[PDB]
Design a protein around this ligand. Structure first.
Ligand SMILES: [Mg+2]
Ligand SMILES: [Mg+2]
Ligand SMILES: [Mg+2]
Ligand SMILES: [Mg+2]
Ligand SMILES: [Mg+2]
Ligand SMILES: [Mg+2]
Ligand SMILES: [Mg+2]
Ligand SMILES: [Mg+2]
Ligand SMILES: [Mg+2]
Ligand SMILES: [Mg+2]
Ligand SMILES: [Mg+2]
Ligand SMILES: [Mg+2]
Ligand SMILES: [Mg+2]
Ligand SMILES: [Mg+2]
Ligand SMILES: [Mg+2]
Ligand SMILES: [Mg+2]
Ligand SMILES: [Mg+2]
Ligand SMILES: [Mg+2]
Ligand SMILES: [Mg+2]
Ligand SMILES: [Mg+2]
Ligand SMILES: [Mg+2]
Ligand SMILES: [Mg+2]
Ligand SMILES: [Mg+2]
Ligand SMILES: [Mg+2]
Ligand SMILES: [Mg+2]
Ligand SMILES: [Mg+2]
Ligand SMILES: [Mg+2]
Ligand SMILES: [Mg+2]
Ligand SMILES: [Mg+2]
Ligand SMILES: [Mg+2]
Ligand SMILES: [Mg+2]
Ligand SMILES: [Mg+2]
Ligand SMILES: [Mg+2]
Ligand SMILES: [Mg+2]
Ligand SMILES: [Mg+2]
Ligand SMILES: [Mg+2]
Ligand SMILES: [Mg+2]
Ligand SMILES: [Mg+2]
Ligand SMILES: [Mg+2]
Ligand SMILES: [Mg+2]
Ligand SMILES: [Mg+2]
Ligand SMILES: [Mg+2]
Ligand SMILES: [Mg+2]
Ligand SMILES: [Mg+2]
Ligand SMILES: [Mg+2]
Ligand SMILES: [Mg+2]
Ligand SMILES: [Mg+2]
Ligand SMILES: [Mg+2]
Ligand SMILES: [Mg+2]
Ligand SMILES: [Mg+2]
Ligand SMILES: [Mg+2]
Ligand SMILES: [Mg+2]
Ligand SMILES: [Mg+2]
Ligand SMILES: [Mg+2]
Ligand SMILES: [Mg+2]
Ligand SMILES: [Mg+2]
Ligand SMILES: [Mg+2]
Ligand SMILES: [Mg+2]
Ligand SMILES: [Mg+2]
Ligand SMILES: [Mg+2]
Ligand SMILES: [Mg+2]
Ligand SMILES: [Mg+2]
Ligand SMILES: [Mg+2]
Ligand SMILES: [Mg+2]
Ligand SMILES: [Mg+2]
Ligand SMILES: [Mg+2]
Ligand SMILES: [Mg+2]
Ligand SMILES: [Mg+2]
Ligand SMILES: [Mg+2]
Ligand SMILES: [Mg+2]
Ligand SMILES: [Mg+2]
Ligand SMILES: [Mg+2]
Ligand SMILES: [Mg+2]
Ligand SMILES: [Mg+2]
Ligand SMILES: [Mg+2]
Ligand SMILES: [Mg+2]
Ligand SMILES: [Mg+2]
Ligand SMILES: [Mg+2]
Ligand SMILES: [Mg+2]
Ligand SMILES: [Mg+2]
Ligand SMILES: [Mg+2]
Ligand SMILES: [Mg+2]
Ligand SMILES: [Mg+2]
Ligand SMILES: [Mg+2]
Ligand SMILES: [Mg+2]
Ligand SMILES: [Mg+2]
Ligand SMILES: [Mg+2]
Ligand SMILES: [Mg+2]
Ligand SMILES: [Mg+2]
Ligand SMILES: [Mg+2]
Ligand SMILES: [Mg+2]
Ligand SMILES: [Mg+2]
Ligand SMILES: [Mg+2]
Ligand SMILES: [Mg+2]
Ligand SMILES: [Mg+2]
Ligand SMILES: [Mg+2]
Ligand SMILES: [Mg+2]
Ligand SMILES: [Mg+2]
Ligand SMILES: [Mg+2]
Ligand SMILES: [Mg+2]
Ligand SMILES: [Mg+2]
Ligand SMILES: [Mg+2]
Ligand SMILES: [Mg+2]
Ligand SMILES: [Mg+2]
Ligand SMILES: [Mg+2]
Ligand SMILES: [Mg+2]
Ligand SMILES: [Mg+2]
Ligand SMILES: [Mg+2]
Ligand SMILES: [Mg+2]
Ligand SMILES: [Mg+2]
Lengths: 112, 80, 205, 87, 81, 61
RNA sequence: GAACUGAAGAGUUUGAUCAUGGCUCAGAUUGAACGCUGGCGGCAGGCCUAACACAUGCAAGUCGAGCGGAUGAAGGGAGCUUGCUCCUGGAUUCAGCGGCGGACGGGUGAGUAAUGCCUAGGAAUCUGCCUGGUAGUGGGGGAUAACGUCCGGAAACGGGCGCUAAUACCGCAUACGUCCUGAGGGAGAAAGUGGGGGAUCUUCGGACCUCACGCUAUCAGAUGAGCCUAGGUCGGAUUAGCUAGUUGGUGGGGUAAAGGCCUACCAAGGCGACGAUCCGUAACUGGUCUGAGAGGAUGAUCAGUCACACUGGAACUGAGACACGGUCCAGACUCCUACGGGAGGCAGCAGUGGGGAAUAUUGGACAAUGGGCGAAAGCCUGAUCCAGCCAUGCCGCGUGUGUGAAGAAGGUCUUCGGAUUGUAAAGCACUUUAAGUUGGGAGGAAGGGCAGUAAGUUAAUACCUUGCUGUUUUGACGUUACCAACAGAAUAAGCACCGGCUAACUUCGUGCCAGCAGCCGCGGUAAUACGAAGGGUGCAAGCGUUAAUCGGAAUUACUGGGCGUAAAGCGCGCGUAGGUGGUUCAGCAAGUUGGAUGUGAAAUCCCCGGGCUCAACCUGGGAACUGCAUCCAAAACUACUGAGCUA
């Protein structure tokens, strides 16, 4: 919580100093804890001076109902690295217009 | 011995069977006023000697048809 | 649990004797017992009916050192019994083992008698009982463990019980420090200023 | 099936079903002969069929294929039909 | 069959037993037709170790009820006293 | 729904997971719930020392 | 001698008052959750949500004294020689046939508004194992699994070819009972094993006698189940008609048994404002919580019944199933695969993911009580008994005791004198509960094996059953409960509140801000209401907040309210169902009253007791269960019947 508060302070100060940014929100679910941190590190500098990427929620394991509706709430793209979605997540995704994609190589995620 | 019931004939249009209405008074569970409830039974009458309005008495026996398990024993009052 | 802390504050708050010290010297010349405890001691501040009921119940509780839940239990059992629950409550509270030991005179205060009971030094019918709630039945012969009869506290408190007013419902043999509890005292024998009707009014609410 | 006893029980049940079906059919056809003889008014043939059918009915009821009240009912009804036909 | 056995009440590490007549295919503490005594393993003081109704026990024995081993021992123990 | 945030300060922002309990705020129209301080993402108030169990504050120690 | 004995109000509409009326508060309860805090023990409780999907272990086997068969020790030894071979026998273990068990015990509450449940009854039925009787258990036949041979397969395993036993199967004889039939007569069963033995005959393989187990027929009893009747069992009329095998009859079929259960004819019936049909919701009860009671709310834990077992059907075997770890068919969803081909069902116990505010260990043992098999040892048992985790609840105990005034130092306030924290601290002297260490130490245990002895068993000191004696042997819990010794005060207080309701008050900051708040309402420069500090008040290993039920609420008023003006008399008549009925006799006994009998499961609540050092907890007896049903008696009132009278 303390780190979140400090990062919020830094982000608010930077946004006030510069202007405004357009954020691409991503929910990211990986299969192993090691892959998650590499993906998060690679998806940091991919932005620009007007558009940035933010990981609104991570996690380890398959795609569930909770992260599906989190992506719905935040208008985020749902990414699964070597993981699948169960019946509930599939139902929620198909009912709404959520787009969720499967990857086995991190560079496909980077290109997308 | 054997327990019986007494009622009044209300329908006899079926063959060898009659419908008898039985009145009872029940105290209301909460308000305590006696109110009239009724039962409609089907009784077996072998020889067709009952008419509408006859005051008759019946007894319980084994089932003789679906919804028919009573047979009458005596006619105590005849319809005018 | 148990109340541990200042014991002259309770007397000042209740405004009466409420025996809580050894009684050696006096009560007045230790706490100037005419002001309520705290900063605003000199104010009189009359109190409502609920306040009076609460003060009476708290006074009784503070004299026997019983907490609220056990007091609820005592009140419920007294009400369940026959014959004027108001005096049945005191009948019940006088039969506690620590109170009995205090009456027999082996302890200076109620807390000291409680520690004598708890620390395995009192036997009721010839076996050790260390529960300071054991309801002593009439005719029981309370005693002291032979390995602990030469403790200075019991002998010191014996004369203090010698000059405090005879209870006249228990007997004690001083050489063997062993006494008999004839019967629970009648309502007249207890101090006829504890108006239990306030307690009954408070709880029946 | 998972436990071996369940498999053994299934095998035995199949064996006894195959054994019992033939006996049931035997009783049924012996009764049917009497019934269709009665429907054809062939009196003497009816007594012949009845005397041929009673022992097998009783035997198979005793073996437990059919219950004895069933056999008694069959015998009584067939005898009544034949007796009414004879007159 | 119909059997006479022990139904366990009491509490942890302190058992108490009811002499019960039951159909054999019931739970140890379930249905019964009649209780005909009790048995107290700890007893002590004014408590009784075991008590039995002789008339009911004899009636149920005469109807073919089959006592358990413990009940079989306890019945003759009670009869001896 | 709409919840009320008690205490002098808070750190709630977008997409913050919170726990809510019952309780109506009389002055605010349409506010029927309260946000529990110090449960999931609220962290409770700081520099509070009296009655600091309704605001999720640890003992100063 | 008892079984109960019990009922509070306050705040808020006004300048003030009385009334009406709503809102709110003070109490008791949770399968609770969250925040802060957290020493011990006893006894209980622990997925309320997704009847969502499930990786991996275990949860149902037993019998060699029913039967073949193959593995066949110890030994008698022999032979050659010290290593081996072989004949004789043979103690163990079981892949297969066969008998019982698997329909119990365990889980869940989806469906179900009545084929369920509760109360009271009755008649047309079945019931393995158990008990008591009665009559028996005679004599033959044909097959088959296992086992050898061939083929196929990634394997699983499958298919074809020959042989063999039984308490497996099928004929024949006989029948105390039983079936049907009309008296006349006809019909229907079985299986043999194990232990001893005097005599008789033998191949002392055996027959024969006896004992034990088992088998057949049937009656009775217990236990369990099936079937029927009457009453009762949530909300809705902004749901009024429903029903053609539908309602009754006859002939026939069918069932263990009554019955439209089924079928062919005949008739046109049956249900419904005393609520049918339809829609929504829901397992029911004993009970639980609240309440002075009457009521209201509600079916966690425990007990009884019902229903279900991935979804939809169906039957077989069986005494019993439409079958929870069985079969077949179809479906949805996972998975294996060598690509040809198969498997699966945690709402059993632990466990996982998921959903959620939220609910635990891949533990130990069959020592005890039960259950299955066995004859008996004995084998199996996630039932059960015990442990692990969690302040989830109830109860109990600790966190010391006495003395101690320079009224210490510090903090706080002040009228600057002092007051308060406060005997509180320090100092002085005591004790060791619980926890810590060490040594002792029950009770849960009945029984099993062996030898002898005494009775009965016959025909017999034999085998066998039972008594007793002697010896031996049994505990997961467990380092048990408990008892004793050792050192030391050492190891162990927090939470809410302080304007009124409501017990508890002053300072300092801030100034319609920041904030508080259950209701009145506080905050705009002296705030007892915000935030802190001193002081105090309630509880206490807990304390508060949130959610929910009842109470207060006489605020749905039967007990126990109202309608001129506060809400509330239809615009007015007539009249149907219904409710109610002037006054005499006489009868009847439905209502009413009294009595007797049966039932109203146990547990729970209440009274008197008994055990755990107390309590919680367990447990004996009683009381109660206010109900229902059947008989007997009475006749004032109501109802019914007959005859009157005139208000
Ligand atoms: Mg029917
Ligand atoms: Mg406590
Ligand atoms: Mg088998
Ligand atoms: Mg037979
Ligand atoms: Mg049970
Ligand atoms: Mg059950
Ligand atoms: Mg609230
Ligand atoms: Mg009012
Ligand atoms: Mg005003
Ligand atoms: Mg909360
Ligand atoms: Mg917490
Ligand atoms: Mg905490
Ligand atoms: Mg559930
Ligand atoms: Mg779930
Ligand atoms: Mg096993
Ligand atoms: Mg045998
Ligand atoms: Mg075998
Ligand atoms: Mg079944
Ligand atoms: Mg079953
Ligand atoms: Mg069952
Ligand atoms: Mg359970
Ligand atoms: Mg259900
Ligand atoms: Mg449920
Ligand atoms: Mg319906
Ligand atoms: Mg039924
Ligand atoms: Mg019932
Ligand atoms: Mg046979
Ligand atoms: Mg024959
Ligand atoms: Mg034979
Ligand atoms: Mg049943
Ligand atoms: Mg009914
Ligand atoms: Mg209805
Ligand atoms: Mg027809
Ligand atoms: Mg008919
Ligand atoms: Mg017929
Ligand atoms: Mg017909
Ligand atoms: Mg309706
Ligand atoms: Mg439901
Ligand atoms: Mg009331
Ligand atoms: Mg009640
Ligand atoms: Mg009550
Ligand atoms: Mg209900
Ligand atoms: Mg349950
Ligand atoms: Mg049950
Ligand atoms: Mg029932
Ligand atoms: Mg049941
Ligand atoms: Mg039933
Ligand atoms: Mg069922
Ligand atoms: Mg299941
Ligand atoms: Mg499932
Ligand atoms: Mg199915
Ligand atoms: Mg089939
Ligand atoms: Mg079949
Ligand atoms: Mg069958
Ligand atoms: Mg079933
Ligand atoms: Mg089954
Ligand atoms: Mg099934
Ligand atoms: Mg079942
Ligand atoms: Mg299963
Ligand atoms: Mg199949
Ligand atoms: Mg299929
Ligand atoms: Mg399929
Ligand atoms: Mg499953
Ligand atoms: Mg489970
Ligand atoms: Mg379930
Ligand atoms: Mg989970
Ligand atoms: Mg979750
Ligand atoms: Mg929890
Ligand atoms: Mg559980
Ligand atoms: Mg066992
Ligand atoms: Mg063996
Ligand atoms: Mg195990
Ligand atoms: Mg505890
Ligand atoms: Mg807590
Ligand atoms: Mg809990
Ligand atoms: Mg000073
Ligand atoms: Mg100790
Ligand atoms: Mg022992
Ligand atoms: Mg030790
Ligand atoms: Mg006050
Ligand atoms: Mg406050
Ligand atoms: Mg100020
Ligand atoms: Mg206040
Ligand atoms: Mg304040
Ligand atoms: Mg709180
Ligand atoms: Mg609340
Ligand atoms: Mg509520
Ligand atoms: Mg509430
Ligand atoms: Mg009311
Ligand atoms: Mg209320
Ligand atoms: Mg009232
Ligand atoms: Mg009224
Ligand atoms: Mg009114
Ligand atoms: Mg009126
Ligand atoms: Mg007006
Ligand atoms: Mg009008
Ligand atoms: Mg008018
Ligand atoms: Mg009108
Ligand atoms: Mg009208
Ligand atoms: Mg009109
Ligand atoms: Mg009008
Ligand atoms: Mg009129
Ligand atoms: Mg009229
Ligand atoms: Mg009149
Ligand atoms: Mg009338
Ligand atoms: Mg009269
Ligand atoms: Mg009566
Ligand atoms: Mg009862
Ligand atoms: Mg006691
Ligand atoms: Mg009379």
């Amino acid at each position: 919580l303390a780190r979140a508060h400090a990062g919020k302070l830094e982000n608010i100060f930077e946004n006030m100093g510069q202007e405004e940014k357009k954020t691409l929100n991503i929910v990211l679910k990986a299969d192993v804890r090691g892959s998650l941190e590499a993906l998060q590190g690679s998806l940091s500098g991919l932005g620009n001076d007007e558009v940035q990427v933010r990981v609104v929620g991570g996690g380890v394991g398959g795609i569930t109902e909770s992260d599906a509706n989190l992506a719905l709430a935040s208008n985020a793209v749902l990414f699964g690295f070597n993981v699948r979605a169960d019946a509930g997540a599939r139902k929620i995704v198909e009912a709404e217009g959520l787009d969720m994609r499967y990857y086995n190589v991190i560079y496909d995620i980077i290109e997308d | 011995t054997v327990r019986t019931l007494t009622g009044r004939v209300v329908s006899d249009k079926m063959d060898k069977t009659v419908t008898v209405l039985i009145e009872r008074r029940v105290k209301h569970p909460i308000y305590g006023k006696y109110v009239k409830r009724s039962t409609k039974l089907h009784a077996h009458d072998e020889s067709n000697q009952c008419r509408i309005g006859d005051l008759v008495t019946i007894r319980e026996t084994r089932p003789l048809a679906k919804t028919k398990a009573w047979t009458l024993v005596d006619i105590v009052e005849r319809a005018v | 649990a148990r109340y541990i802390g200042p014991k002259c504050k309770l007397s000042r708050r209740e405004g009466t004797d409420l025996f809580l010290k050894s009684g050696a010297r006096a009560l007045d010349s230790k706490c100037k017992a005419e002001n309520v405890p705290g900063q605003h001691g000199q104010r009189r501040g009359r109190l409502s009916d609920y306040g009076l009921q609460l003060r009476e119940k708290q006074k009784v509780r503070r004299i026997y050192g019983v907490l609220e839940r056990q007091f609820r239990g005592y009140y419920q059992e007294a009400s369940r019994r026959k014959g004027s629950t108001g005096e049945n409550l005191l009948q019940l509270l006088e039969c506690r083992l620590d109170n009995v030991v205090y009456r027999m005179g082996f302890g200076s205060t109620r807390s000291e008698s409680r520690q004598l009971v708890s620390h395995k030094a009192i036997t009721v019918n010839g076996q050790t009982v260390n529960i300071p709630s054991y309801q002593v039945k009439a005719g029981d012969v309370v005693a002291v463990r032979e390995k602990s009869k030469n403790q200075l506290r019991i002998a010191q408190a014996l004369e203090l019980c010698g000059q405090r007013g005879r209870v006249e419902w228990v007997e004690v043999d001083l050489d063997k420090k062993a006494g008999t509890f004839k019967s629970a005292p009648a309502r007249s024998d207890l101090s006829a200023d504890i108006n239990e009707n306030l307690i009954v009014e408070l709880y029946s609410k | 099936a998972n436990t071996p006893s369940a498999k053994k029980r299934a095998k035995q049940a199949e064996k006894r079903r195959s054994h019992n079906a033939s006996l049931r059919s035997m009783v049924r056809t012996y009764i049917k002969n009497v019934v269709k003889a009665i429907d054809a008014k062939d009196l003497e043939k009816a007594q012949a069929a009845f005397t041929a059918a009673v022992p097998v009915i009783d035997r198979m009821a005793d073996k437990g294929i059919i219950h004895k009240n069933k056999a008694a009912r069959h015998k009584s009804r067939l005898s009544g039909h034949i007796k009414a036909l004879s007159t | 069959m119909v059997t006479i056995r022990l139904a366990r009440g009491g509490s942890k590490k302190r058992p108490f037993y009811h002499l019960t007549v039951t159909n054999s295919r019931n739970a140890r503490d379930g249905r019964f037709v009649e209780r005909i005594g009790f048995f107290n393993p700890v007893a002590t003081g004014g408590e009784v170790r075991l008590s039995v109704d002789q008339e009911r026990a004899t009636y149920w024995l005469g109807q073919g009820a089959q006592p358990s081993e413990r009940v079989a021992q306890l019945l003759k123990d009670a009869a001896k006293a | 729904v709409s919840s009320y945030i008690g205490g002098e300060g808070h750190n709630l922002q977008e997409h913050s997971v919170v726990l809510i309990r019952g309780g109506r705020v009389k002055d605010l129209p349409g506010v029927r719930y309260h946000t529990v301080r110090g449960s999931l993402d609220t962290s409770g108030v700081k520099d509070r020392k009296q009655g600091r169990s309704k605001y999720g504050a640890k003992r100063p120690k």
